[PDB]
Amino acid sequence: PADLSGTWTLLSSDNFEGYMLALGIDFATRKIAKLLKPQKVIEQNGDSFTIHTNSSLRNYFVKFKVGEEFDEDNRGLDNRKCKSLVIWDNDRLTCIQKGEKKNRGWTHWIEGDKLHLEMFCEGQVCKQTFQRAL
Numbered sequence: 001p002a003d004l005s006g007t008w009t010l011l012s013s014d015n016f017e018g019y020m021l022a023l024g025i026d027f028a029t030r031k032i033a034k035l036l037k038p039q040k041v042i043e044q045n046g047d048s049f050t051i052h053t054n055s056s057l058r059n060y061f062v063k064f065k066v067g068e069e070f071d072e073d074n075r076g077l078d079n080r081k082c083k084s085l086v087i088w089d090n091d092r093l094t095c096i097q098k099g100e101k102k103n104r105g106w107t108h109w110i111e112g113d114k115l116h117l118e119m120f121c122e123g124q125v126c127k128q129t130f131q132r133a134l
């Protein structure tokens with residue numbers, strides 16, 4: 001494990017378009033989504049996490065415990081129900097989102113004090129990095 005906690009500013013983002021296409025996000029929504037640049041806020045306490053993705057249009061957050069399956073409504077995203085599970089893959093926090101789409105999930109890790117994220121669905125990987133905001 002690693003301490004991923006913090007307030008994180010999006011610094012780079014690659015292939016968000018392909019990830020959203022894999023999710024079927026509509027044309028006008030993809031346009032807006034690529035402009036929003038949400039702040040990522042990770043609250044981490046032992047095995048308990050709350051990960052926020054915050055923008056002016058709306059916030060999304062997920063609250064979970066490592067190793068504890070939970071249904072995720074994805075409301076405000078693609079609105080598809082998944083059964084999600086987050087576990088540590090060495091020092092990379094890995095979420096499997098079981099549902100209609102294949103190979104759907106995300107992974108966070110930290111390199112120095114730089115936060116990394118892959119969001120992926122059916123072969124489309126969106127790679128983002130972040131810097132600590134404050």
Ligand SMILES: C=C(C)[C@@H]1CCC(C)=C[C@H]1c1c(O)cc(O)cc1CCCCC
Pocket residue numbers: 013016020023025029030032033034036037038053054055058059060076077078
């Ligand atoms: C929760 C949000 C701030 C937005 C909400 C609206 C959409 C369609 C995408 C989210 C979004 C965004 O607009 C930019 C991002 O870099 C990441 C994400 C979260 C993942 C969205 C996957 C559909």
